[PDB]
């Protein structure tokens, strides 16, 4: 897992790509920008953005 990556073999967890699947349909899935559920994680201290 800590080697140089392969998106094709890392598609579908680790079992490789799907039958009759094209690159644009697999990659450009139109997923929304995820908002992390950091309830169990420990968020580091805020450093402030450029607006601050």
């Amino acid at each position: 897992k800590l080697q140089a990556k392969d998106p094709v073999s890392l598609e579908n967890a680790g079992h490789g790509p799907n039958f009759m699947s094209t690159e644009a349909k697999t990659r450009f899935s139109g997923r929304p920008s995820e908002r992390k559920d950091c309830s169990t994680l420990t968020v580091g201290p805020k450093e402030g953005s450029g607006y601050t």
Binding site: P7, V8, E11, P17, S21, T22
Partner: protein
Amino acid sequence: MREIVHMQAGQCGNQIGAKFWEVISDEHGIDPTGTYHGDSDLQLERINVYYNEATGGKYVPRAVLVDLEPGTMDSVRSGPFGQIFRPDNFVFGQSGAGNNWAKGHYTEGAELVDSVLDVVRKEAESCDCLQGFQLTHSLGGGTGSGMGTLLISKIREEYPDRIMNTFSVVPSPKVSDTVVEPYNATLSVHQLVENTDETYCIDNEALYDICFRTLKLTTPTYGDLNHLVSATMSGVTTCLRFPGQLNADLRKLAVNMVPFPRLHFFMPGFAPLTSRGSQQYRALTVPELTQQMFDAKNMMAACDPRHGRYLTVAAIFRGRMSMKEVDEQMLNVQNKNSSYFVEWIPNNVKTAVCDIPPRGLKMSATFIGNSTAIQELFKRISEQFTAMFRRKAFLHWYTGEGMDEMEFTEAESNMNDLVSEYQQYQDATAE
């Protein structure tokens, strides 16, 4: 909405076109009845390239099936996936010579050409884009070469702007199986030079070589040779049918291989090809695909590529790939064997990566070579022809229907100019 109208001429044409139609019908999900049973919208979105919808939701191949004698066409109607064809585009003659280019091109071929031309006009006017024409004939016979070259001449005179490729199964020294093969090939190669845009020359002894050493099979029969030819045929139009990262249709392939109008005699190949007992023991990758294509024992033409120089190589890869391995494998091949590539054209590789592999294979590739080593078959056929023509043997069978020996001399001379042109563009340096 590009499309190709297909033509089968002769017994070999009607066999290796039948196998081509059933393998692409399997790729497109078409039943032997004709009703779709696939799983993806990609499998129908570009089905208009080869099929016509009919009333009742059934797809018909856009093919014209021509033979002088109607035994092979009864066989192709009887074969599996044989009932998808229309019965209108089944053109037959009552008589018919066979293994006689004069009596396939001049006599009993001058009146059946009107019927096949009418069918071609019908199938071409039933179109909106009409990318082009695909003839799957074979040199050596009468109606394969004579009627086939007459069809190519008529089509080139009618539509001289559409892409139009012939395949041809050009004669071999060892398998032979016909006395008049040098005459039949010599009388048709100059017509192919003048008219055909892409000639994908296949050879029977090379197909037997593949099914003997590459994949074992212990009895290659005839269906496996046709399946190799059919997979090679399907690997060229996979950019026309299925989408991919980098696309190349027939016109792009013609532009990016042929440098000059007369040098359009490609030699094809296919990868992967494994034995049935060692298919699960192989790591199928793009580098190993390149290993298999760039090899003398894999090419489906009888020429050894090491005996000349590559002008251009087309690699039509199929599958979920990374473009960097494709580019670096082609460049490593060129940089290693740079002596076998012409130096006045840098980077002699056209690359087309499609996203849909053929069924049963995860990672496939189709090879096309414009090698200058293709002149060995032409020199061989020329010396066989001049051996049979130095004393005029089997010549009354050709001159009984108005053909002159000056036609034979002109065909031999033009074939010699083709050989000399290939020699010149092999030995030419960046002066």
